[PDB]
Amino acid sequence: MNIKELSLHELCEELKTPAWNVPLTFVGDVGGTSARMGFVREGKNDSVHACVTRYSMKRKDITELIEFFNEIIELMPASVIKRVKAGVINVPGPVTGGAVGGPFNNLKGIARLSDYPKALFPPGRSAILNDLEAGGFGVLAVSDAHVFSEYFGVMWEGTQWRTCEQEPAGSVIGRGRCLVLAPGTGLGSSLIYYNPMNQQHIVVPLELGSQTIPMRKDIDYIQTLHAELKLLPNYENMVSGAGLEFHYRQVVRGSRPPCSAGEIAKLASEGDANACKAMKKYHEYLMRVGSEASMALLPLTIVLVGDNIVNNAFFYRNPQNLKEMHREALNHEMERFGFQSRVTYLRQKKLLNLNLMGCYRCGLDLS
Amino acid sequence: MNIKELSLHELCEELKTPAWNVPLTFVGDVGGTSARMGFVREGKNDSVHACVTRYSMKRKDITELIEFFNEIIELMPASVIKRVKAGVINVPGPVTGGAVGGPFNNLKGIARLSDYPKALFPPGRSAILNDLEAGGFGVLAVSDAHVFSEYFGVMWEGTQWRTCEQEPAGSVIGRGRCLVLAPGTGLGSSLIYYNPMNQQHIVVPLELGSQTIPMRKDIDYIQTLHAELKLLPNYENMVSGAGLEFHYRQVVRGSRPPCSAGEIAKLASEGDANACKAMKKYHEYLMRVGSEASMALLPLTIVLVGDNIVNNAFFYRNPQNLKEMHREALNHEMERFGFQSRVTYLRQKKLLNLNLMGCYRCGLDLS
Ligand SMILES: O=C(N[C@@H]1[C@@H](O)[C@H](O)[C@@H](CO)O[C@H]1O)OCc1ccccc1
Ligand SMILES: O=C(N[C@@H]1[C@@H](O)[C@H](O)[C@@H](CO)O[C@H]1O)OCc1ccccc1
């Protein structure tokens, strides 16, 4: 279970070692700021090994990936380019058919698997994933690698865990639906559906973040944001970089100049009461995605993934914040039946690019 | 594709005919009021014959089902019970592990597969489905029989359709996500997911009805029901029997008398303005479910199913109500990127028991 980040040149060098003679999967984790492309292999002992290289989404244009793909094949021995079983990339948007991606909120243009090289993307063994679909696949990879507890911690157990499972919560993904949320630049969601007929997990990409926020007792707070965006706020408007910034502005009341999402998180890590309140506010709305999705989708587990999540561990480690989140997760009318208390919440507690493992894990199903 | 309903006696008689000395599938359609149970055979050239009997949920308890199975067993010879190869029932509630059902809204108790007699429920070849999970399967069954355009009409064709499908809209399910909605007594919802990897369709049960309603410009309207319920309204509160009645009582303000739901749709068919106004408001919220779910689930199609939709066909054929339903389906901030209008909307136009067909098709996958 491991990935080594390299420059394009050291990548080429590495790709000639005797360890990298096995058949290979081309993977790419594309974001709105940067992309990470490279190759994955199993070596020995059920171990996953990848080395990738970072590219900057400079033009901020999804089609720039075509360029990078070329730049790889040219500058690389075709005694390696031939060992390519499958090509799988993820992109930060809705993907249709596994072959067309867009429109994007970060970028412009459309991801088209047809306009991709076939040395990197062998026909019938190639897919374009939504990033959180790749992440879901990754979550599945972590479970099959028997290492779930190493990357995910329980935030609190739901009622339904012990009725489906004898193992401790956090030790396995569990024979139930698992909803994956990624609160980052944007707000990513996917549902790892569980088919009880055949006991199979299947990743279903979702756009939970773009739904209109339903109310609680916060009609005014929503209205304030509504008036800034000229749009009915959706969850992502409240749970995202711009959302955290918004919450900070509402907290200070102009008495401090606006600072960035990242900076707000730093301040909270440093104990700043204003930032900290902004963080709590952000998490109040994350937990609303949770309680609504818990009803609609009935998951056995909800899992919070991403580097944001791992890095903000100072926040989840605090049991007062955790109880307030727990409180808000149950703040749904249907809780009087226990529907929100069914669910187990976990969070990623250790850095791992779930999307990269996801692309490779998906590559297996294609071949 | 053909279902004769009988009674216990003539059922036990029917099953002695040598057209029924063939592999049998036990099916059960459990509504909130009645329950249809019987057996399904295959016959000459992809012919699917079903034979069922009716029951009453007079105790309004799900566990009562177990005593119906007992009756069937005893009054049924061992000659024919032995031929049961699969048993599949649907129930009007959330189901877990295809085995535990509940809690229910219209009924008390919990549906346990572990309590059902193994004569009708062969272990490893039987399941409990949610009613719309079963309807989902039914929808697939209709498509496979190449008879889709017979039972479903196109309300409007969405943008993503000609791009994913060459066949005309309405003539096949389509290689895309299909969101099934059943606005009847309760608001049912299931999502037939299409996995572009293996080209397989999967049915994913949802509870969209019980999520808290997002606002448009209807705060006061929502507050009013909120006040009557002492509960934050969810889509089902607006789209259901109780929801239609409520829309009526808000039209007349007290003038005319309060009617039952069926009565209101009746008055609307005949032309009553109060009634037609009430059904427009109901469909305004039905369309908001689709609007919000179109974003969250990215369906290629939305299909409205139920005896309701066939019976109230007059409302949908009216080119005026359709233009208005269309306008509400696109009433979503995310429409500025075309998300809502991607989706093709169809309605059931001919009576058919989707759930019973569904139980049978699920049964076939379990064998
Ligand atoms: O792009 C998104 N949604 C994306 C998701 O697909 C993705 O999983 C998530 C994590 O990167 O970021 C969201 O912003 O919605 C479609 C959209 C939104 C806004 C403008 C155009 C298109
Ligand atoms: O029962 C349901 N939901 C049911 C659905 O499962 C079903 O598909 C639909 C059509 O029959 O009616 C809804 O009311 O949710 C659980 C619940 C809801 C409200 C109160 C108690 C329990």
PDB file of C-alpha atoms in Angstrom, chain B residues 45-273:
ATOM      1  CA  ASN B  45     -41.270 -18.627 -26.018  1.00  0.00           C
ATOM      2  CA  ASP B  46     -40.271 -16.105 -23.292  1.00  0.00           C
ATOM      3  CA  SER B  47     -43.814 -16.132 -21.897  1.00  0.00           C
ATOM      4  CA  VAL B  48     -44.049 -15.244 -18.244  1.00  0.00           C
ATOM      5  CA  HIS B  49     -47.216 -16.369 -16.503  1.00  0.00           C
ATOM      6  CA  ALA B  50     -48.015 -15.465 -12.913  1.00  0.00           C
ATOM      7  CA  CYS B  51     -50.833 -16.664 -10.682  1.00  0.00           C
ATOM      8  CA  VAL B  52     -51.544 -14.928  -7.371  1.00  0.00           C
ATOM      9  CA  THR B  53     -54.126 -14.511  -4.597  1.00  0.00           C
ATOM     10  CA  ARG B  54     -55.091 -11.428  -2.544  1.00  0.00           C
ATOM     11  CA  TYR B  55     -54.867 -10.786   1.224  1.00  0.00           C
ATOM     12  CA  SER B  56     -55.767  -7.991   3.679  1.00  0.00           C
ATOM     13  CA  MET B  57     -53.354  -6.208   6.022  1.00  0.00           C
ATOM     14  CA  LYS B  58     -56.258  -5.736   8.460  1.00  0.00           C
ATOM     15  CA  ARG B  59     -54.052  -6.044  11.505  1.00  0.00           C
ATOM     16  CA  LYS B  60     -51.831  -3.354   9.926  1.00  0.00           C
ATOM     17  CA  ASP B  61     -48.848  -5.443  11.034  1.00  0.00           C
ATOM     18  CA  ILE B  62     -46.134  -6.826   8.730  1.00  0.00           C
ATOM     19  CA  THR B  63     -45.470  -9.919  10.855  1.00  0.00           C
ATOM     20  CA  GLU B  64     -48.964 -11.074   9.893  1.00  0.00           C
ATOM     21  CA  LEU B  65     -47.314 -12.016   6.586  1.00  0.00           C
ATOM     22  CA  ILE B  66     -45.809 -15.056   8.279  1.00  0.00           C
ATOM     23  CA  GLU B  67     -49.270 -16.543   8.906  1.00  0.00           C
ATOM     24  CA  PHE B  68     -50.203 -16.063   5.239  1.00  0.00           C
ATOM     25  CA  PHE B  69     -47.196 -18.204   4.297  1.00  0.00           C
ATOM     26  CA  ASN B  70     -48.324 -20.838   6.801  1.00  0.00           C
ATOM     27  CA  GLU B  71     -51.804 -20.964   5.218  1.00  0.00           C
ATOM     28  CA  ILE B  72     -50.386 -21.246   1.700  1.00  0.00           C
ATOM     29  CA  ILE B  73     -48.085 -24.070   2.876  1.00  0.00           C
ATOM     30  CA  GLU B  74     -50.798 -26.237   4.478  1.00  0.00           C
ATOM     31  CA  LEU B  75     -53.457 -25.738   1.808  1.00  0.00           C
ATOM     32  CA  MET B  76     -50.769 -26.354  -0.807  1.00  0.00           C
ATOM     33  CA  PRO B  77     -49.774 -29.955  -1.555  1.00  0.00           C
ATOM     34  CA  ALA B  78     -46.176 -31.086  -1.235  1.00  0.00           C
ATOM     35  CA  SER B  79     -46.512 -31.890  -4.973  1.00  0.00           C
ATOM     36  CA  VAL B  80     -46.165 -28.217  -5.874  1.00  0.00           C
ATOM     37  CA  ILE B  81     -44.356 -26.646  -2.870  1.00  0.00           C
ATOM     38  CA  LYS B  82     -41.373 -28.870  -3.707  1.00  0.00           C
ATOM     39  CA  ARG B  83     -41.140 -27.061  -7.041  1.00  0.00           C
ATOM     40  CA  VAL B  84     -40.366 -23.689  -5.397  1.00  0.00           C
ATOM     41  CA  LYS B  85     -36.842 -22.661  -6.505  1.00  0.00           C
ATOM     42  CA  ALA B  86     -36.899 -18.992  -5.378  1.00  0.00           C
ATOM     43  CA  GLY B  87     -39.031 -16.805  -3.123  1.00  0.00           C
ATOM     44  CA  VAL B  88     -39.077 -13.024  -3.394  1.00  0.00           C
ATOM     45  CA  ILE B  89     -41.342 -10.482  -1.691  1.00  0.00           C
ATOM     46  CA  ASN B  90     -41.552  -6.689  -1.689  1.00  0.00           C
ATOM     47  CA  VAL B  91     -42.600  -4.523   1.273  1.00  0.00           C
ATOM     48  CA  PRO B  92     -43.322  -0.787   1.634  1.00  0.00           C
ATOM     49  CA  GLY B  93     -40.284   0.163   3.728  1.00  0.00           C
ATOM     50  CA  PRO B  94     -36.503   0.436   3.951  1.00  0.00           C
ATOM     51  CA  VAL B  95     -34.910  -3.006   3.757  1.00  0.00           C
ATOM     52  CA  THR B  96     -31.465  -4.009   4.963  1.00  0.00           C
ATOM     53  CA  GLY B  97     -29.411  -6.994   3.758  1.00  0.00           C
ATOM     54  CA  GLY B  98     -32.395  -8.036   1.639  1.00  0.00           C
ATOM     55  CA  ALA B  99     -33.695  -9.628   4.825  1.00  0.00           C
ATOM     56  CA  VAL B 100     -34.822  -7.079   7.411  1.00  0.00           C
ATOM     57  CA  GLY B 101     -37.643  -4.632   6.657  1.00  0.00           C
ATOM     58  CA  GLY B 102     -38.626  -1.545   8.630  1.00  0.00           C
ATOM     59  CA  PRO B 103     -39.637   0.397  10.498  1.00  0.00           C
ATOM     60  CA  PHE B 104     -42.624   1.162   8.278  1.00  0.00           C
ATOM     61  CA  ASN B 105     -44.690   4.356   8.007  1.00  0.00           C
ATOM     62  CA  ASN B 106     -48.054   2.829   7.145  1.00  0.00           C
ATOM     63  CA  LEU B 107     -47.565  -0.385   9.153  1.00  0.00           C
ATOM     64  CA  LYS B 108     -46.163  -1.606  12.473  1.00  0.00           C
ATOM     65  CA  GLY B 109     -43.636  -4.391  12.983  1.00  0.00           C
ATOM     66  CA  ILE B 110     -40.431  -5.569  11.311  1.00  0.00           C
ATOM     67  CA  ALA B 111     -40.216  -7.945   8.322  1.00  0.00           C
ATOM     68  CA  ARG B 112     -37.674 -10.661   9.038  1.00  0.00           C
ATOM     69  CA  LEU B 113     -36.624 -13.169   6.370  1.00  0.00           C
ATOM     70  CA  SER B 114     -35.161 -15.427   9.068  1.00  0.00           C
ATOM     71  CA  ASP B 115     -38.722 -15.977  10.332  1.00  0.00           C
ATOM     72  CA  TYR B 116     -40.209 -16.933   6.971  1.00  0.00           C
ATOM     73  CA  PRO B 117     -40.828 -20.600   6.123  1.00  0.00           C
ATOM     74  CA  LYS B 118     -38.020 -22.054   4.011  1.00  0.00           C
ATOM     75  CA  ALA B 119     -40.571 -23.892   1.827  1.00  0.00           C
ATOM     76  CA  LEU B 120     -41.398 -20.610   0.100  1.00  0.00           C
ATOM     77  CA  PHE B 121     -38.051 -18.964   0.883  1.00  0.00           C
ATOM     78  CA  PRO B 122     -35.217 -21.362  -0.090  1.00  0.00           C
ATOM     79  CA  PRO B 123     -32.089 -20.049   1.658  1.00  0.00           C
ATOM     80  CA  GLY B 124     -29.600 -18.495  -0.754  1.00  0.00           C
ATOM     81  CA  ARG B 125     -32.338 -18.117  -3.344  1.00  0.00           C
ATOM     82  CA  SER B 126     -34.750 -15.687  -1.677  1.00  0.00           C
ATOM     83  CA  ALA B 127     -34.967 -11.991  -0.648  1.00  0.00           C
ATOM     84  CA  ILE B 128     -37.050  -9.160   0.798  1.00  0.00           C
ATOM     85  CA  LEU B 129     -37.030  -6.112  -1.471  1.00  0.00           C
ATOM     86  CA  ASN B 130     -38.290  -2.581  -0.877  1.00  0.00           C
ATOM     87  CA  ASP B 131     -41.415  -1.985  -3.006  1.00  0.00           C
ATOM     88  CA  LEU B 132     -39.609   0.436  -5.361  1.00  0.00           C
ATOM     89  CA  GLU B 133     -36.576  -1.825  -5.476  1.00  0.00           C
ATOM     90  CA  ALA B 134     -39.027  -4.416  -6.817  1.00  0.00           C
ATOM     91  CA  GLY B 135     -40.558  -1.824  -9.138  1.00  0.00           C
ATOM     92  CA  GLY B 136     -37.044  -1.017 -10.372  1.00  0.00           C
ATOM     93  CA  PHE B 137     -36.568  -4.637 -11.321  1.00  0.00           C
ATOM     94  CA  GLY B 138     -40.004  -4.551 -12.954  1.00  0.00           C
ATOM     95  CA  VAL B 139     -38.934  -1.596 -15.051  1.00  0.00           C
ATOM     96  CA  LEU B 140     -35.913  -3.606 -16.234  1.00  0.00           C
ATOM     97  CA  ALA B 141     -38.160  -6.580 -17.001  1.00  0.00           C
ATOM     98  CA  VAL B 142     -40.388  -4.415 -19.202  1.00  0.00           C
ATOM     99  CA  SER B 143     -37.359  -3.139 -21.132  1.00  0.00           C
ATOM    100  CA  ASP B 144     -35.954  -6.639 -21.681  1.00  0.00           C
ATOM    101  CA  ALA B 145     -39.275  -7.805 -23.139  1.00  0.00           C
ATOM    102  CA  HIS B 146     -38.903  -5.062 -25.829  1.00  0.00           C
ATOM    103  CA  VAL B 147     -42.266  -3.739 -24.716  1.00  0.00           C
ATOM    104  CA  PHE B 148     -41.056  -0.515 -23.035  1.00  0.00           C
ATOM    105  CA  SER B 149     -42.809   1.919 -25.404  1.00  0.00           C
ATOM    106  CA  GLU B 150     -46.092   0.131 -24.623  1.00  0.00           C
ATOM    107  CA  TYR B 151     -46.095   0.804 -20.882  1.00  0.00           C
ATOM    108  CA  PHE B 152     -44.225   4.108 -20.784  1.00  0.00           C
ATOM    109  CA  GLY B 153     -44.792   7.453 -22.492  1.00  0.00           C
ATOM    110  CA  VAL B 154     -42.262  10.246 -23.026  1.00  0.00           C
ATOM    111  CA  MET B 155     -43.226  13.431 -21.139  1.00  0.00           C
ATOM    112  CA  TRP B 156     -40.212  15.193 -22.549  1.00  0.00           C
ATOM    113  CA  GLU B 157     -36.911  14.125 -23.928  1.00  0.00           C
ATOM    114  CA  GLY B 158     -33.788  15.273 -22.178  1.00  0.00           C
ATOM    115  CA  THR B 159     -30.565  16.556 -23.584  1.00  0.00           C
ATOM    116  CA  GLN B 160     -28.310  13.608 -22.725  1.00  0.00           C
ATOM    117  CA  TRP B 161     -30.479  11.031 -24.511  1.00  0.00           C
ATOM    118  CA  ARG B 162     -29.664  11.054 -28.272  1.00  0.00           C
ATOM    119  CA  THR B 163     -26.061  11.306 -27.201  1.00  0.00           C
ATOM    120  CA  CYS B 164     -26.131   8.037 -25.138  1.00  0.00           C
ATOM    121  CA  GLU B 165     -28.811   6.117 -27.086  1.00  0.00           C
ATOM    122  CA  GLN B 166     -29.639   5.595 -30.756  1.00  0.00           C
ATOM    123  CA  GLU B 167     -33.018   4.003 -30.109  1.00  0.00           C
ATOM    124  CA  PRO B 168     -35.878   6.517 -29.766  1.00  0.00           C
ATOM    125  CA  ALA B 169     -36.681   7.798 -26.302  1.00  0.00           C
ATOM    126  CA  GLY B 170     -39.353   5.758 -24.554  1.00  0.00           C
ATOM    127  CA  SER B 171     -38.519   2.542 -26.415  1.00  0.00           C
ATOM    128  CA  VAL B 172     -35.868   1.180 -24.051  1.00  0.00           C
ATOM    129  CA  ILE B 173     -34.710   1.896 -20.515  1.00  0.00           C
ATOM    130  CA  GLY B 174     -31.456   3.286 -21.879  1.00  0.00           C
ATOM    131  CA  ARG B 175     -27.833   2.748 -20.955  1.00  0.00           C
ATOM    132  CA  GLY B 176     -27.975   5.305 -18.185  1.00  0.00           C
ATOM    133  CA  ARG B 177     -29.207   5.871 -14.665  1.00  0.00           C
ATOM    134  CA  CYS B 178     -32.947   5.613 -14.371  1.00  0.00           C
ATOM    135  CA  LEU B 179     -34.636   7.264 -11.368  1.00  0.00           C
ATOM    136  CA  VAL B 180     -37.908   5.581 -10.584  1.00  0.00           C
ATOM    137  CA  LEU B 181     -40.442   7.585  -8.603  1.00  0.00           C
ATOM    138  CA  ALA B 182     -43.846   6.312  -7.377  1.00  0.00           C
ATOM    139  CA  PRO B 183     -45.953   9.219  -6.097  1.00  0.00           C
ATOM    140  CA  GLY B 184     -48.899   7.403  -4.585  1.00  0.00           C
ATOM    141  CA  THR B 185     -49.938   6.884  -1.008  1.00  0.00           C
ATOM    142  CA  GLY B 186     -46.330   7.284  -0.060  1.00  0.00           C
ATOM    143  CA  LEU B 187     -43.499   8.703  -2.128  1.00  0.00           C
ATOM    144  CA  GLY B 188     -41.340   5.815  -3.303  1.00  0.00           C
ATOM    145  CA  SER B 189     -37.984   6.112  -5.019  1.00  0.00           C
ATOM    146  CA  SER B 190     -35.333   3.791  -6.354  1.00  0.00           C
ATOM    147  CA  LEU B 191     -32.406   4.392  -8.677  1.00  0.00           C
ATOM    148  CA  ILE B 192     -31.583   1.894 -11.393  1.00  0.00           C
ATOM    149  CA  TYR B 193     -27.875   2.431 -11.693  1.00  0.00           C
ATOM    150  CA  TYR B 194     -26.071   1.625 -14.910  1.00  0.00           C
ATOM    151  CA  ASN B 195     -22.485   0.387 -14.509  1.00  0.00           C
ATOM    152  CA  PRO B 196     -20.642   1.438 -17.692  1.00  0.00           C
ATOM    153  CA  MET B 197     -17.889  -1.097 -16.855  1.00  0.00           C
ATOM    154  CA  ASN B 198     -19.879  -4.326 -17.218  1.00  0.00           C
ATOM    155  CA  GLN B 199     -22.917  -2.747 -18.968  1.00  0.00           C
ATOM    156  CA  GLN B 200     -25.047  -4.163 -16.102  1.00  0.00           C
ATOM    157  CA  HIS B 201     -28.021  -2.428 -14.482  1.00  0.00           C
ATOM    158  CA  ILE B 202     -28.263  -2.448 -10.691  1.00  0.00           C
ATOM    159  CA  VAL B 203     -31.243  -1.410  -8.542  1.00  0.00           C
ATOM    160  CA  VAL B 204     -30.378   0.841  -5.631  1.00  0.00           C
ATOM    161  CA  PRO B 205     -33.235   1.477  -3.155  1.00  0.00           C
ATOM    162  CA  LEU B 206     -33.577   5.100  -1.947  1.00  0.00           C
ATOM    163  CA  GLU B 207     -35.667   7.030   0.567  1.00  0.00           C
ATOM    164  CA  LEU B 208     -35.840  10.420  -1.238  1.00  0.00           C
ATOM    165  CA  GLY B 209     -39.279  11.099   0.158  1.00  0.00           C
ATOM    166  CA  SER B 210     -38.146  11.547   3.746  1.00  0.00           C
ATOM    167  CA  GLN B 211     -35.462  14.157   3.134  1.00  0.00           C
ATOM    168  CA  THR B 212     -36.159  17.740   4.285  1.00  0.00           C
ATOM    169  CA  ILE B 213     -37.554  19.972   1.503  1.00  0.00           C
ATOM    170  CA  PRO B 214     -35.226  22.675   0.093  1.00  0.00           C
ATOM    171  CA  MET B 215     -36.961  26.034  -0.428  1.00  0.00           C
ATOM    172  CA  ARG B 216     -37.678  27.894  -3.617  1.00  0.00           C
ATOM    173  CA  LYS B 217     -39.902  30.927  -3.006  1.00  0.00           C
ATOM    174  CA  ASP B 218     -42.295  29.055  -0.808  1.00  0.00           C
ATOM    175  CA  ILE B 219     -41.124  29.712   2.751  1.00  0.00           C
ATOM    176  CA  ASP B 220     -44.541  30.726   4.051  1.00  0.00           C
ATOM    177  CA  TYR B 221     -46.191  27.742   2.377  1.00  0.00           C
ATOM    178  CA  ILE B 222     -43.606  25.467   3.945  1.00  0.00           C
ATOM    179  CA  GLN B 223     -43.964  27.167   7.383  1.00  0.00           C
ATOM    180  CA  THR B 224     -47.749  26.625   7.225  1.00  0.00           C
ATOM    181  CA  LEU B 225     -47.473  22.853   6.864  1.00  0.00           C
ATOM    182  CA  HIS B 226     -44.522  22.907   9.294  1.00  0.00           C
ATOM    183  CA  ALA B 227     -46.975  24.434  11.794  1.00  0.00           C
ATOM    184  CA  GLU B 228     -49.721  21.832  11.115  1.00  0.00           C
ATOM    185  CA  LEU B 229     -47.257  18.957  11.439  1.00  0.00           C
ATOM    186  CA  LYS B 230     -44.935  20.198  14.170  1.00  0.00           C
ATOM    187  CA  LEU B 231     -42.300  18.566  11.936  1.00  0.00           C
ATOM    188  CA  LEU B 232     -39.969  20.018   9.258  1.00  0.00           C
ATOM    189  CA  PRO B 233     -41.709  19.044   6.003  1.00  0.00           C
ATOM    190  CA  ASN B 234     -40.113  16.477   3.723  1.00  0.00           C
ATOM    191  CA  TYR B 235     -41.088  15.824   0.086  1.00  0.00           C
ATOM    192  CA  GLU B 236     -43.564  13.134   1.127  1.00  0.00           C
ATOM    193  CA  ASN B 237     -45.537  15.633   3.222  1.00  0.00           C
ATOM    194  CA  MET B 238     -46.109  17.608  -0.017  1.00  0.00           C
ATOM    195  CA  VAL B 239     -46.327  14.725  -2.494  1.00  0.00           C
ATOM    196  CA  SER B 240     -48.720  12.088  -1.129  1.00  0.00           C
ATOM    197  CA  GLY B 241     -52.379  11.674  -0.237  1.00  0.00           C
ATOM    198  CA  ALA B 242     -51.972  13.916   2.812  1.00  0.00           C
ATOM    199  CA  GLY B 243     -49.996  16.382   0.695  1.00  0.00           C
ATOM    200  CA  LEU B 244     -52.657  16.746  -2.014  1.00  0.00           C
ATOM    201  CA  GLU B 245     -55.440  17.188   0.580  1.00  0.00           C
ATOM    202  CA  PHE B 246     -53.333  19.852   2.231  1.00  0.00           C
ATOM    203  CA  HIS B 247     -52.838  21.665  -1.106  1.00  0.00           C
ATOM    204  CA  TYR B 248     -56.598  21.602  -1.510  1.00  0.00           C
ATOM    205  CA  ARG B 249     -57.314  23.048   1.933  1.00  0.00           C
ATOM    206  CA  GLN B 250     -54.912  25.878   1.116  1.00  0.00           C
ATOM    207  CA  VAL B 251     -56.703  26.616  -2.159  1.00  0.00           C
ATOM    208  CA  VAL B 252     -60.223  26.856  -0.747  1.00  0.00           C
ATOM    209  CA  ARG B 253     -59.127  28.522   2.532  1.00  0.00           C
ATOM    210  CA  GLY B 254     -62.313  27.147   4.113  1.00  0.00           C
ATOM    211  CA  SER B 255     -64.939  27.819   1.445  1.00  0.00           C
ATOM    212  CA  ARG B 256     -65.581  24.395  -0.077  1.00  0.00           C
ATOM    213  CA  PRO B 257     -65.287  21.327   2.221  1.00  0.00           C
ATOM    214  CA  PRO B 258     -62.046  19.304   2.750  1.00  0.00           C
ATOM    215  CA  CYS B 259     -61.804  16.211   0.481  1.00  0.00           C
ATOM    216  CA  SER B 260     -59.822  12.954   0.478  1.00  0.00           C
ATOM    217  CA  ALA B 261     -56.963  12.671  -2.031  1.00  0.00           C
ATOM    218  CA  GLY B 262     -58.747  10.339  -4.480  1.00  0.00           C
ATOM    219  CA  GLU B 263     -61.744  12.671  -4.371  1.00  0.00           C
ATOM    220  CA  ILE B 264     -59.589  15.671  -5.310  1.00  0.00           C
ATOM    221  CA  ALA B 265     -58.005  14.021  -8.347  1.00  0.00           C
ATOM    222  CA  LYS B 266     -61.557  12.966  -9.295  1.00  0.00           C
ATOM    223  CA  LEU B 267     -62.804  16.575  -9.173  1.00  0.00           C
ATOM    224  CA  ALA B 268     -59.786  17.671 -11.215  1.00  0.00           C
ATOM    225  CA  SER B 269     -60.462  15.110 -13.930  1.00  0.00           C
ATOM    226  CA  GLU B 270     -63.986  16.512 -14.140  1.00  0.00           C
ATOM    227  CA  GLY B 271     -62.553  20.046 -14.318  1.00  0.00           C
ATOM    228  CA  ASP B 272     -62.892  21.665 -10.859  1.00  0.00           C
ATOM    229  CA  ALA B 273     -60.535  24.656 -10.677  1.00  0.00           C
TER     230      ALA B 273
END
